[PDB]
RNA sequence: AUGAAUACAUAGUGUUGCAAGGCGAACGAGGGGAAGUGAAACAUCUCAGUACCCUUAGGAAAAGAAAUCAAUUGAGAUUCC
RNA sequence: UAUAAUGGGUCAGCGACUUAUAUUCAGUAGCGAGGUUAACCGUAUAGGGGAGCCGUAGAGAAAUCGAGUCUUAAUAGGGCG
RNA sequence: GAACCCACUGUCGUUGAAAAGCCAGGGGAUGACUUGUGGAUAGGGGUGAAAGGCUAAUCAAGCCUGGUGAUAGCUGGUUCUCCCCGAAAGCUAUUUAGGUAGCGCCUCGGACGAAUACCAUAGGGGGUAGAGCACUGUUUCGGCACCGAUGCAAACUCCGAAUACCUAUGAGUACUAUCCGGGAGACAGACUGCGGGUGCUAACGUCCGUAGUCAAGAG
RNA sequence: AUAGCACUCUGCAAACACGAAAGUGGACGUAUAGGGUGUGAUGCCUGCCCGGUGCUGGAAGGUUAAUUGAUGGGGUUAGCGUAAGCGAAGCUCUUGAUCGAAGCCCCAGUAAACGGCGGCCGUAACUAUAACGGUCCUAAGGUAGCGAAAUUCCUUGUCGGG
RNA sequence: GAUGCAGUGUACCCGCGGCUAGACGGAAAGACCCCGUGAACCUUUACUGCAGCUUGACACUGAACUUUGAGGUUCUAACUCUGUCCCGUGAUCCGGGACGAGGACCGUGUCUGGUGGGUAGUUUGACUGGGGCGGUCUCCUCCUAAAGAGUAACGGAGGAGUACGAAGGUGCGCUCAGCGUGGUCGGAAAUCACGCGUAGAGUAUAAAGGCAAAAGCGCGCUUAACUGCGAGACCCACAAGUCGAGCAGGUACGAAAGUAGGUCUUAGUGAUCCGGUGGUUCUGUAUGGAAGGGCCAUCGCUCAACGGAUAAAAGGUACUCUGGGGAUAACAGGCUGAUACCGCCCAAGAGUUCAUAUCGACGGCGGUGUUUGGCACCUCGAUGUCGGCUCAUCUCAUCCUGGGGCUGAAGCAGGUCCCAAGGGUAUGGCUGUUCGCCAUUUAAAGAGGUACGCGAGCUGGGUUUAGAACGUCGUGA
RNA sequence: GCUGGCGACCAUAGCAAGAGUGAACCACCUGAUCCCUUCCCGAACUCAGAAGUGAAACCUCUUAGCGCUGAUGGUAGUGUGGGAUUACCCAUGUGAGAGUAAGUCAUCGCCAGCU
C-alpha cells in the first residue's frame, strides 16, 4: 500500500487580460499567488495579490525600476 | 480550544457581536468598543455566555 | 300441570300452542384485519381499513331535525353531485 | 462476430407503446381585452344553467402599498418589476 | 438356518421390464420383532433410537385458491414504405461505479443577420523542448570549506524557442455566430501516430494529453 | 440409542408440557416418584482454578418507574394610576421538592455449571544434563495415564521387526 | 484453436458393417467466481418490537386489638379449594345447599420498571488490474501536466481538522545570517567592540509563489477583527467559492496628504431538517390578548463513507435459491517472455610449463516457447477431469546402435565437439500420486509438443456437495 | 564652467583602485542653555552657532582589474507534408543556450546659487 495519492484541487491562476486589451473599472487583469506582477498606474491590488483596474483604458504590461519589476497599468 | 463568546452592547439594545477566546491566557471577561447600529453610536460590549 | 336439598318457596320436569333454523348475485350495517409493494436500502410512514375471515337486514340500508356552523351578526335536519 | 458467442426443425394462425384523468408545448378553428361554462334541467347533440376557472400587475416572509415595491438612518446605492 | 423383515458388495440396466429394479452373494429371524384393520397428532405446526429425516414420486418451512397483472436499476423481444439531418461512450455528483441527474455533444420550431470562422498584419504573457551550473542537490581529478579543470537533475534554473492561447484591424471565401423554446440519445469504447506516467523503453497490457480512422463507412 | 453413572429441579392444585381459556397429559403416580442436562458395559480411576459468565444465598448502603404534587416562573382581568404601567382573586400553561419496588452496583458459595490450566534466565568433582535456584504475570499454571495418535506442520522424525 | 476466408495438395457417383479423433457434439438460461442498494433459513454481548416471566401503585379489599409512616396479633363476611356430605339425578361434568380447611393473603384488570434470539421484521458502504485481507474516502502545496486554463493511475513527495485582543489598526523608527580580529570566568558556540564579503536570516505553521514603501523587526496610542451597501470582474452542472474601486454613518492613529471592512497569500471544514438564546413599527382561526409561526442575529455534527439514504443496526450457509456477466476470477487457448531452459562473445585464472585437452571469474549478446508468472482477448442460454489403462503421432536440443575431428588419445577405456530421427528404448516394493527413494535387470531404460495427446474409448484411488469425528479458530451459527 | 535639490533611466550606466576639490554650496566641526532625544549614551534625532579642516565623507576625472553588454557563422530544438522506429532522414518555414570577434568607466530633464 502506498503512502501517497493526494492532492489538492487546481485554482485556476494566471494572466486574464492581456497587453492591448480594453478593460473597464473592476475587471480583473491577473491571478497570481504572490507579486509576480506588480501595480502600476490605475491598477489596484487586493488582499490576495490579485490585480484589477480601476480606470477605464488599455492594458499594458512593462518592466521597469531599479528592480526589473513587472508591472501592468492602464492607460486612459 | 478556543470557546467562543458574546460580546453585548452595554446600551441596552440587545446588539451583539460573536467571537472566541482562549480561558487560559484571558481568564477575566473581556470588553471593547464597537459600533452599535441600532443606536449609531460607538459604545463599550462586554462579554457573555454564548449559550 | 307437576315438583328437590328445605318449612314457604325456587331450581328441575312434562303437555299444549306459536315462532325460528337452511339456501341464494350485487349493494348496506357491524365485529376482526395482513403482506407483497413505494420510500430507488429500512424500522416511523405507505400499501390500507384494501384483500380476506365472521355476524346480520332491506328493497334499498345508513344518516337525520343542531348542546351545528358562522363571524357585516348571518345561516338553518339528513343524503348525493 | 463467418465466428466454434445468443435465438430459430418447417408452415399456417395469434403475439408487445394502450386507456382514463391532469398538465405543458406545437398546429388548426371560433371569439377577442376578453374567453369559457360544470353539476343539473331539458320528449334532450339544441336551448337554458355565470357558481367557478384562465387572462388583464407587481414588490414584499408578512402587515401593507401599488407602476411601483423591498432593503436602509438615507430622496444614496442595489434587487425584483 | 427357510417363510417374513431388511439393503453390506459386485456385474447388468441408465430413451430401463422398473421415475430406485434383476441376478449372485449378504444381515436379523421369540424380539427394542414383523404385520392386517380402524383411529390420534396439521405447516413456523406435527412427528423424529436425530439423517434437517419424514409429513401422498414435492420439504431449511407441504399442497390449493386468493392479495396478484407482487416487484425486477436485469436478460430477451418489439411487426409496412420513402425523404432530410445526425451523436456519445466526456466532466461533475451519487450506498455510486453495467443505474441516474445537471452540463458537453444530436434534432425540430421561432427570433436575429456578419456580430462567426479560415488567413495576413499588429499588440501581449509564458518557463516546456533545448541548454546551463548563477541557487538547491549530486559527480570525478588535482591544489591549498575554498581555487582550477570536468559531468548530471520530474519535484534545480543565470537563460530559453517552435507551436499553442488572448485581443484589434483587414481582403476573399463560406449559411457562420448568438438568443428563446419542443424532443432525444449517451455517460463499457477500440486501434494507430506523436508527448508522457506505470510496467521489463514487455504485452492486441494499463492510465492521461493530442490528431486520424472504426464505432455509425461501402469501393 | 442403550443398560450403568452423575448433577440439578419437583411437597402435590408438584415441577414440566399443550391451550386464548375452560381444561388435558405428568398420574388415577407421590422423592426407592416424576422432569431436564451430560456421560455411555465393565476394570483402575477422575488432578488444580470461583478471576469471567451463569446459578444459589446474603446486605440494606448507592442508583432508579408509575403514582404523589411542596415550591418557583408565566397567560388572562376586576381594580388602581394623567401616563408609563402596576395589579389581587378565579381559571389556566409550566417547573418540579418529598414518598416510592424489583433489577443493577457490593459480599460469599458453586466446575460430573458454561469455561481455564503461563513465560524469561542460571546452576553438581571429565563433558553433557540440570536434582536445584533466580525471578515476571495470573483465578490457577496439567496430577495419574497416554503420545509422529481418527490429534504431529517440519515429516517418508529416529531406532528395531517384517 | 476454420468443412465454409487465402494459397496450395488431393479427390469419379451412391450404399452396407464397424469406430469415436473433430463438428469448441446432445442434455440442463454454470451449481465454482463476481455483480444486484435480490431471496430464504440459521446464529449472536448487531438494531428495533412482541410473547412469556417478574416488580411496585390503584381496583376487586373488610373488621378489632398493639408497637415505633410502618410493623405485630386476632377475626369473618368478600374471595379459594383438582376436600367431605345432601339434592337436581339412573351423572368422578355443572349448579344449588350444609360442613371443613384457608382468607383480606393468593389471584385477576389498568398503569409501570426489569428480564427477554423464545419469537418477528430488518441492517451489515464503495473504490479495487477478479473478490477477500491490507490501504484509501474531505481540504492545502509541488511534480507528472506536453511555456494560457484544465487534465488520470492502489503514480512520486509532504501538510491540515489550528493559533492570535495582539501575532489586528495606525504614526514613528530599525535591519538579518555568516566569517575574521581582539576582549574575565567563557569555551566549538552566551555578551562587548571593529571590520570583511555577502540575502545565504526571518516571515505562528507544510510547500509554492512572494517580500525595501520591506509583507521581516521594535515603541506609543488604540479597536476598521465596524454598520448599510456595492459599479465591475474571476471561477463555475447546480448548490457553492473568490477579488473589488466607490458612496453614507460612526471611529482609531497621524501636523498633514492619508491608512484601516483582521493576520504576505493559498489549508484549519459540514448542506437541509429539528430544536435553544437575543431582538422584532410582521402574523395571531369570533373580538382583545396569549400560545404558536415568520423575519434579523446567533448556538447544538470526526453526519471524517466529509453532497451528509434512518433518530436508531452484526454474522453464517458445504442445507441452500433467483435474476444476470466471458462487462470479472479458477482449466485449457491467445499476446508477452521478467522468470525458466538452451546457445554464443570476451577472457583474470585452474590445469607441474600451457586461457582455449577439460574447466572457466568479472561482464556482454541471443534462441525456444516444456516452468513460475504478467494481461484479461475467446468460452459462465456449460470448452465439464489429477493420476492410471488402451491406443498413438510428430520434433531433435540423441539414451542405444551407425559415421567422424581433437585429446592432458600407448592399449583397453574415458572426456569433448560435429553428422545422423532407420529401428529400438525394464519388471517390481512403498505411496492416490505425477515425481521421488529403493531392489534386480538391459545395448539403452532420452528430452519434449500433441486442449500439461487420448474420460460421446475404460476406471474413479486423490481433489471439491450432502453424514460423522479429531487438532485448531470462533460466544455462536 | 563648479555646487545643491527633485526626476527620467536601472550596470555599455555597476563595483574596485588611483588622483583632485573649499569664493559660494555641502560636509565634517563647537556644546547641550531653552525645543526634542537615547529600553544607557547629544552615537543617531533636535536645538543655538561659526574657532578649525577639506582628513573622513560626498562629488569630479583616469584605468578594462572584476563585472556587464555582445555580433556573424554553425549546432540543438521545433510547426506542416513525406519516409523510418533508440528517436532519426528529406522538403519547407522557424531558430536558441553556450562559446568567439567586439563594445562599455553612461545619456537626458526642471529649478536655484557661484563666477
Ligand atoms: C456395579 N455397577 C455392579 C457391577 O458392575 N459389578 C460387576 C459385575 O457383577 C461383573 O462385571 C462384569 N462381569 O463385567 C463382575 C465380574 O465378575 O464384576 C463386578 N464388579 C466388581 N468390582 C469388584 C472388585 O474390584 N472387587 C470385589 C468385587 O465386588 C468385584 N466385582
Given at each position: 500500500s502506498t503512502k501517497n495519492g493526494r492532492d489538492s484541487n487546481p485554482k485556476?491562476?494566471?494572466?486574464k487580460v492581456y497587453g492591448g486589451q480594453t478593460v473597464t473599472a473592476g475587471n480583473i487583469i491577473v491571478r497570481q499567488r504572490g507579486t509576480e506582477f506588480h501595480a502600476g498606474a490605475n491598477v489596484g491590488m487586493g488582499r490576495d495579490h490579485t490585480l484589477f483596474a480601476t480606470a477605464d483604458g488599455v492594458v499594458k504590461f512593462e518592466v521597469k525600476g531599479q528592480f526589473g519589476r513587472r508591472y501592468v497599468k492602464v492607460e486612459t | 480550544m478556543r470557546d467562543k463568546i458574546r460580546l453585548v452592547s452595554s446600551?441596552?439594545?440587545?446588539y451583539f457581536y460573536t467571537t472566541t477566546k482562549n480561558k487560559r491566557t484571558m481568564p477575566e471577561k473581556m470588553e471593547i468598543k464597537k459600533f452599535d447600529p441600532k443606536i449609531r453610536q460607538h459604545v463599550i460590549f462586554k462579554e457573555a455566555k454564548i449559550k
Open positions: 485556476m491562476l494566471g494572466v | 446600551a441596552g439594545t440587545g
